[PDB]
Amino acid sequence: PDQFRAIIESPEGAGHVGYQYRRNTGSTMRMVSDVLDERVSLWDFHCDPSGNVIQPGPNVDSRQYLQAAIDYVSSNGGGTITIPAGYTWYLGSYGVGGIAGHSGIIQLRSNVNLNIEGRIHLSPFFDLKPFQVFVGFDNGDPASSGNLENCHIYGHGVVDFGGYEFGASSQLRNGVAFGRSYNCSVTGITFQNGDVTWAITLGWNGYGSNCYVRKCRFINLVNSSVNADHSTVYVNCPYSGVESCYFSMSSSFARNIACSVQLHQHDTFYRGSTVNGYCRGAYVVMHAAEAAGAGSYAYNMQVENNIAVIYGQFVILGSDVTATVSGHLNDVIVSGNIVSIGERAAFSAPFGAFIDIGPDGASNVQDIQRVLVTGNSFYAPANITDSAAITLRANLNGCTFIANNFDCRYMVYNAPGTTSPVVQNLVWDKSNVIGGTHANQRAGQNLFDMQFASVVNSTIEVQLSCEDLSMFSCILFPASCQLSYSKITVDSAWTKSMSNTAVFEGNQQAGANVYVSYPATVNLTSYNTQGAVPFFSTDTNYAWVTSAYSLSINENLDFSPPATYTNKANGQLVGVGYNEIGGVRSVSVRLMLQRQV
Amino acid sequence: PDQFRAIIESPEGAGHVGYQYRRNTGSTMRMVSDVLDERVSLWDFHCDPSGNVIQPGPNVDSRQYLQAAIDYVSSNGGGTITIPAGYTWYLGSYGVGGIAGHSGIIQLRSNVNLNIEGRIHLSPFFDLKPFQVFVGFDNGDPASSGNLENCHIYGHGVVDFGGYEFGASSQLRNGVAFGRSYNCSVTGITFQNGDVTWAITLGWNGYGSNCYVRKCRFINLVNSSVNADHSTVYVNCPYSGVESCYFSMSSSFARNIACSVQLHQHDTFYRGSTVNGYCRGAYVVMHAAEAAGAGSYAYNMQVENNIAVIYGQFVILGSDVTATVSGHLNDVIVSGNIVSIGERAAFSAPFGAFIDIGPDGASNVQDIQRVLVTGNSFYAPANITDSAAITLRANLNGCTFIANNFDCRYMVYNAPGTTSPVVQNLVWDKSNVIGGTHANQRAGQNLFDMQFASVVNSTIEVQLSCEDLSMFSCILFPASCQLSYSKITVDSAWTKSMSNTAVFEGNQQAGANVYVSYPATVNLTSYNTQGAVPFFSTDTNYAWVTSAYSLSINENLDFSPPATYTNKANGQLVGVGYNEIGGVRSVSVRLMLQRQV
Amino acid sequence: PDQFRAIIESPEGAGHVGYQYRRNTGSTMRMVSDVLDERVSLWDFHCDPSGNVIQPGPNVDSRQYLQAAIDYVSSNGGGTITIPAGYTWYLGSYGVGGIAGHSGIIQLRSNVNLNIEGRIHLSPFFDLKPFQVFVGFDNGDPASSGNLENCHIYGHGVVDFGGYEFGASSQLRNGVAFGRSYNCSVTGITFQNGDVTWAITLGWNGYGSNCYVRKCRFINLVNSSVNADHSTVYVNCPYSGVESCYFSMSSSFARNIACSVQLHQHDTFYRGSTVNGYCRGAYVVMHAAEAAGAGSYAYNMQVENNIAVIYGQFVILGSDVTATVSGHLNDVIVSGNIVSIGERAAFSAPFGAFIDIGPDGASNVQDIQRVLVTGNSFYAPANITDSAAITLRANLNGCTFIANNFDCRYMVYNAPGTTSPVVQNLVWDKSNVIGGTHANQRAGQNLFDMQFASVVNSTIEVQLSCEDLSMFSCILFPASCQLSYSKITVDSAWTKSMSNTAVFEGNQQAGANVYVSYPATVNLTSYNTQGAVPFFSTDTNYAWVTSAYSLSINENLDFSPPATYTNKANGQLVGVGYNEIGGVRSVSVRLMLQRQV
Numbered sequence A, B, C: 001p002d003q004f005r006a007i008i009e010s011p012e013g014a015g016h017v018g019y020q021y022r023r024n025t026g027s028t029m030r031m032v033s034d035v036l037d038e039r040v041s042l043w044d045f046h047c048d049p050s051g052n053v054i055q056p057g058p059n060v061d062s063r064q065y066l067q068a069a070i071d072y073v074s075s076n077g078g079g080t081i082t083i084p085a086g087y088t089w090y091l092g093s094y095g096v097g098g099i100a101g102h103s104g105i106i107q108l109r110s111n112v113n114l115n116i117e118g119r120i121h122l123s124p125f126f127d128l129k130p131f132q133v134f135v136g137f138d139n140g141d142p143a144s145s146g147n148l149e150n151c152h153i154y155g156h157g158v159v160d161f162g163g164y165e166f167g168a169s170s171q172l173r174n175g176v177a178f179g180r181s182y183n184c185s186v187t188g189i190t191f192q193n194g195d196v197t198w199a200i201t202l203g204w205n206g207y208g209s210n211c212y213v214r215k216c217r218f219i220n221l222v223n224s225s226v227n228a229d230h231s232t233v234y235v236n237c238p239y240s241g242v243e244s245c246y247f248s249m250s251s252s253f254a255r256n257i258a259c260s261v262q263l264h265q266h267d268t269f270y271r272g273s274t275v276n277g278y279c280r281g282a283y284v285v286m287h288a289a290e291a292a293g294a295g296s297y298a299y300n301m302q303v304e305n306n307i308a309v310i311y312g313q314f315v316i317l318g319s320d321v322t323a324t325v326s327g328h329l330n331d332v333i334v335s336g337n338i339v340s341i342g343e344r345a346a347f348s349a350p351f352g353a354f355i356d357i358g359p360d361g362a363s364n365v366q367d368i369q370r371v372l373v374t375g376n377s378f379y380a381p382a383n384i385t386d387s388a389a390i391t392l393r394a395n396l397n398g399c400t401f402i403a404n405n406f407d408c409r410y411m412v413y414n415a416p417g418t419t420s421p422v423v424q425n426l427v428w429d430k431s432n433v434i435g436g437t438h439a440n441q442r443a444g445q446n447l448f449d450m451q452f453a454s455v456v457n458s459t460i461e462v463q464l465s466c467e468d469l470s471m472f473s474c475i476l477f478p479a480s481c482q483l484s485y486s487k488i489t490v491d492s493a494w495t496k497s498m499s500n501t502a503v504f505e506g507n508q509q510a511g512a513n514v515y516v517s518y519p520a521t522v523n524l525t526s527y528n529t530q531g532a533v534p535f536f537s538t539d540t541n542y543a544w545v546t547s548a549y550s551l552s553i554n555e556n557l558d559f560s561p562p563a564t565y566t567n568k569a570n571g572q573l574v575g576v577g578y579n580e581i582g583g584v585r586s587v588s589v590r591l592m593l594q595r596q597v
């Protein structure tokens, strides 16, 4: 009875006050404490050693209290801890144990979700140091780590990295490393105000499954020249992806170093997202070094329906090897994306591209094939000389382009001098529309500049949609490039006044299995005979031509040249025209030259 | 001790009853009230002046109580107020202060979320009046408004507008106006049973960022002839969009006035949504008048993967100007959408179109370019005369169509008499498939009816997939339309029995930089000579032709006409055929006429 | 005063302890019980008849307690019941009443949501028996069922079917049957460890609207040879769909019987999902037997942006009839999907296809048309003989393919002997890219094997991207197939060494409205005349040819054959070439044969 007042005011008080849901006689006879025990928050562990609550703030290190919360819920089989709204909770010290080797602050645990409604901020303890805010490994060595399963971070809250710069290039910084992560996700959270290597990483070298990042925001996560490299989300487990997210940088350094997403394992996706101020959109890469959990192949890779303003390359494809393992990249789709290179001087950032091959130092280890690039839009402003639909800078075993709209300086490019890629199965369908923004800016340049060691089993069907008489050629193959079993065509529309349409500096268009067609101007002379009369070319450069036809009107009454032509063993063209009256004729005509097509 | 019983039964009672989470000795020693204070609902403010709870209902105006809740949580740095399930909460009066000038009911506040689980209904106080249910402006003048940040409305609940009609055309009605809104969203909510101007508006004249509408339903939000205009979601801030929503109207008036989405600023999207019973799908428009927050350009605009039955136009493109500011629309992608015009009489609703240009009174202020329309399906029933893939009714600086399937009356249309658009960079790739539904319905009509002032730098590659001999022509250019630096082709498949394939009423196909090809029937007569012998056309209408070839078999044994033809200065065609036996020959042949292609 | 202590410890205790939110004098004066009554969990009904809580576990049947919870919340107008984390709740008995006839365990009720955070497991009571875990019908006969409205199942929890096999083929097993379901959804849930017919079904024979499955996982839901058939999600109401889900099977039996999704009513979608280990991706089907709620037509059907490894067919199209009702399928889009047939022996699973027509026993009842298949990737390993872009095994009224990349054994296939489909409006645009994986594996096979009763209003534009000289032909029509009003072309690239390109075993290419072109080798002999001289074919098989042109170079100096040719009534080709010196000439040339193109 005095006992009772004391019990009630004690910490066991709520366990003595009875409750039945809505006065329902059929419901469980409980105590208030039992209903309160259905939820848990940071407030339930944010206390001094005497149990008195501590208010968070800039002079309070909340880390041990959040850890205690996570540890405790973990011991009961899991649940969701709320990080309350209306407060900022500062983190002020490293964690201990298995996450120490990852510079971890907080250790995540299986089945323990965090509902971040308020704000998590890093204290100046972390200035110029490494850190990884949330870590799901439980060992300093990931190979000896257990898994993290069924861990979800969500809510309307914020992770703020406090604006501190990296102290040294070699340091790493992360928001969430799920670790060897199975059914883990981040949803709704804003990550902001940092200089970090990543915001979120998913999986570890192929170990993991079903990890996702959805409806998150990533804002200003690079701020210094010390930051060596940044990729906002690194996807290193299969069956995993990024969807409906927003990424934004404002630093100059971001334009040169930052990528929004890494897809590095099979059945991974990047969709429906908006990117601004980044160097790169996504790398789609199989690293042999990361092939332990899910094999040596990256397949079923999807980059779709994204919106981007970048300064470098939108999608970068690659693979590589180690002494003992070969990585392979195949079965990739890149579709529906609308991308522009932001306003910048030519050459002021890494070379602008929709697709780049990919990635490395060396360019003779890649195995990339069965890639489909379809129904995308790409735009670079007219002054950006270093803008291409594809910069094909390393070996390529296949990539197919259909029904894209590319409006930039080059369609296919690689720098001469540099690498000599071996190219197979490059398909550029006629349904790719080449825009006009760069018209008149192409003096000395080849629209398709095929600076390769070799090209085989490839299709390039060039279709202009406006004039550009500044360009040197539509497509040029240097003498060093071998060409075989390929189809190269230049549609005549908008080409009438071009000196060079297609150029084969080693006369590669003569190969037995090269199928070509392109316009050329040809001078022809007839014999004098009245009636049906042959016309022959004055030059002897057409031994390769299977047929040609006129692309010019005949201003004459008294005669007509042939509508169509074949060739002769000496390299002349020949056709039969008609002299109404006799006389030797001499004409200049625009022809479509054809070989095996 | 008597004191104690009184304290417990008082409103401070729960602050005297102790609690420790799950009896954990390491947890905070709290009081019951502290744990209860972790959440908040409408019940905590829905009380009379003596603090007694009030039951909601049709005779109770809940507005002041919800406002008090919002105001209070706002003062503590935010949180989420629950609008409880199992109840309908009626709103019965206008709000006061800054929202008064917007006819506001409730004022939203920064960081204060609403979890609407029950139903919010408008009382008959609002019949025939304006209203805006939730407003995020804090001033009657938006230019002098502060921002609304981090405000999210979500849950399984409902906003019901009570079915009341507008009282006057000039009135406005809205569900949620976020205002100058940054990181605000609506998720999961059903808006139903109204006559309103909008359901949700995002941003104000470019001010705002990261505003989204996801997984909402909008059902029957137009019901009268007084409603002047309706757009369900108006997106007026950048980096913002609508995803995975459902829109449905059943009113006849909706078919003539209602649009599902307005995208009016850069980096905005409309995706994955289903629309039924609306006039229009989306406007994608840069209004110079709305250019204050985010500049004069709408770029990176995405309409993708939607499903729609509409009565008018699916996507409408536009821009305009004011005295002092010019709006520009560019870098737009429209992809993956499957759209049909619903069953209706011809001309019974605004003209059916997949794309319309856009929007206005005047048609000589627009600057629209770099638009890609790809991989969409469109269908209108055979009786709908007023159905087009594009109604091109105002100036166009570019739009590219690739790999669509359009099955309607017209491919390209504009009404004669009306506007005289100036058209640049219209590209219709050969990979657009023209369906057959309207075959036999086209008497007196031109499949591509090019009723423009001029066309330049344009491509129209016509490819039929079935016969339609009812049509007057595949493509017609009236004499008033200038044509230059363009490519116009008509594939011969399904065209053998057509009198007219392409028609140039001003002989525009003769221009120096016009590249054309199309079938025609030509009568030819030979000279009598045995052996190789010329054939010439009887008409002199072919001065423009660079080459032609036969599309007809030769039923003769004793002779053959030329397989290919050139022309002569008098406008005749000429080729060399072969008389096995001499005689003057006279034949009718179907030729492919070609000019510079 | 003694009374008071007793009241407090009683179940009414919390109704005597006062509370006011955050000590706010303006808030409602409540009691603790009122705030607790804002939420509800399974703990509030999981009690013995004396009200003492029961711990769940493998020897406790939780079913009656969950039912009581649902029943109670239902009586108050709805709300959300939590199934608590950290516990597994076993289900051990059938439900009663209306769900008995559906082998129901739990009955869902309108407006009553379930937030499944822990795990729901089936007890061995259910081994070898039928069951449907959650049922939304309220009558044994669905035709006499009321509706289920506004019922959502969500959270991070799990439904585990306990691994039990089916006891008999004829049994059915389901996770969630919403019933006649309007605004119902499942979000976030993992369904695992079963042998079931379905995981979720939405709607009943067209009755229902706005039902969705989002962000769910379905893992290993087939495990035995007794299971007759499995479809993970069956969508049987309109305006409904599956988005962003993950599906995975590991059983051999799944490879032969299992489909991820059924879309069976209008305005339904399947998007953004990842499938592994299934026989089939989706059926898109109008069954006349299911046409009661929403009519006889399935229209606006979308399968987009999915990722799949299957063993059979990706999308299957169909319709059918009953005595009294005809089903129709139209307005379908299949886009952006990246799909491969998994590693398997040829013929070891149902025939691999991107598209199959569809579905049935009979093949002469279907009405499928206005289907667009665009911008997809498909791959099958080189050893899979039974792999096709389309297996066209029943009547087809239209399907359009544009800008896909198909890398498998056949492009168009149907088995000879078997069905004789009537085919209309099959369009295969030239922008479809045919891959090379199966090169050299095609001995005795036709790349397009047109084994149909008839083809009309169809387009097949064949474009190779590499050589395959193993194949018998690019396209073959047997004599039994009628062909009319169609366009069939074979581009010459990579075809120079092929004996047969296109083959018409009944000489169907001669039809009046057949438009064709393909390469052929032809032997020609000239007359002896010096000068312009005719060359004629030695064979008389070209009565159908309207023109031909050379695809071969001329190795001769003293003469040239014609660049172009027509024909003569006896079936010879003829052209005019040039003898510099006279003599009879005899040459073998590769020509492009053309008819009406």
Ligand SMILES: CC(=O)N[C@@H]1[C@@H](O[C@H]2O[C@H](CO)[C@H](O[C@H]3O[C@H](CO[C@@H]4O[C@@H](C)[C@H](O)[C@@H](O)[C@H]4O)[C@@H](O)[C@H](O)[C@H]3O)[C@H](O[C@@H]3O[C@H](CO)[C@@H](O)[C@H](O)[C@H]3NC(C)=O)[C@H]2O)[C@H](O)[C@@H](CO)O[C@@H]1O
Residues within 6 Å of the ligand: A101, A102, A103, A142, A172, A177, A197, A198, A201, A203, A204, A205, A229, A230, A231, A234, A236, A259, A262, A283, A285, A287, A289, A290, A359, A360
């Ligand atoms: C920034 C970025 O992602 N850049 C990629 C580039 O990635 C390579 O380079 C980056 C540079 O930051 C990473 O290399 C750094 O980090 C690794 C891994 O850290 C260690 O292991 C983790 C688990 C632990 O928590 C840490 O404390 C460290 O012990 C270092 O080993 C390396 O020395 C350091 O430079 C990246 O490594 C990957 O990082 C992901 C995500 O964290 C891990 O899942 C992978 O295991 C790890 N891979 C390897 C092989 O260790 C490097 O892969 C790409 O190569 C390039 C092409 O795609 O694109 C971007 O430039």
Ligand SMILES: CC(=O)N[C@@H]1[C@@H](O[C@H]2O[C@H](CO)[C@H](O[C@H]3O[C@H](CO[C@@H]4O[C@@H](C)[C@H](O)[C@@H](O)[C@H]4O)[C@@H](O)[C@H](O)[C@H]3O)[C@H](O[C@@H]3O[C@H](CO)[C@@H](O)[C@H](O)[C@H]3NC(C)=O)[C@H]2O)[C@H](O)[C@@H](CO)O[C@@H]1O
Residues within 6 Å of the ligand: B101, B102, B103, B142, B172, B177, B197, B198, B201, B203, B204, B205, B229, B230, B231, B234, B236, B259, B262, B283, B285, B287, B289, B290, B359, B360
């Ligand atoms: C229904 C619809 O959206 N129709 C568009 C059409 O939009 C123009 O016309 C509509 C007609 O309803 C709007 O014009 C009406 O409303 C504006 C704005 O309301 C005022 O300002 C707001 C902030 C405040 O809350 C209100 O109390 C008012 O003070 C009025 O000024 C105008 O007189 C009235 O007719 C629409 O205006 C825009 O509305 C959006 C969303 O609310 C605001 O964010 C914009 O600021 C505002 N724009 C301007 C210039 O004020 C008009 O833009 C489109 O023009 C057309 C082409 O896209 O498509 C549909 O027909």
Ligand SMILES: CC(=O)N[C@@H]1[C@@H](O[C@H]2O[C@H](CO)[C@H](O[C@H]3O[C@H](CO[C@@H]4O[C@@H](C)[C@H](O)[C@@H](O)[C@H]4O)[C@@H](O)[C@H](O)[C@H]3O)[C@H](O[C@@H]3O[C@H](CO)[C@@H](O)[C@H](O)[C@H]3NC(C)=O)[C@H]2O)[C@H](O)[C@@H](CO)O[C@@H]1O
Residues within 6 Å of the ligand: C101, C102, C103, C142, C172, C177, C197, C198, C201, C203, C204, C205, C229, C230, C231, C234, C236, C259, C262, C283, C285, C287, C289, C290, C359, C360
């Ligand atoms: C597994 C699968 O979906 N396979 C489809 C195939 O579907 C047909 O065959 C399956 C085989 O499981 C279904 O037929 C079985 O179930 C129906 C319906 O069950 C009865 O009604 C329900 C409401 C009740 O809960 C049950 O207790 C039963 O009374 C049986 O009538 C039939 O005898 C049995 O074999 C499927 O039926 C459909 O099932 C869906 C989803 O549950 C219901 O919404 C439909 O009402 C019901 N349709 C009909 C006509 O009853 C059959 O349609 C497809 O036909 C095929 C082509 O798409 O693809 C897969 O193979």
Ligand code: NA
Residues within 6 Å of the ligand: A101, A102, A103, A140
């Ligand atoms: Na480390």
Ligand code: NA
Residues within 6 Å of the ligand: A452, A453, A454, A480, A481, A482
């Ligand atoms: Na070389």
Ligand code: NA
Residues within 6 Å of the ligand: B101, B102, B103, B140
């Ligand atoms: Na106003």
Ligand code: NA
Residues within 6 Å of the ligand: B452, B453, B454, B480, B481, B482
């Ligand atoms: Na004009």
Ligand code: NA
Residues within 6 Å of the ligand: C101, C102, C103, C140
């Ligand atoms: Na039954």
Ligand code: NA
Residues within 6 Å of the ligand: C452, C453, C454, C480, C481, C482
């Ligand atoms: Na037949």
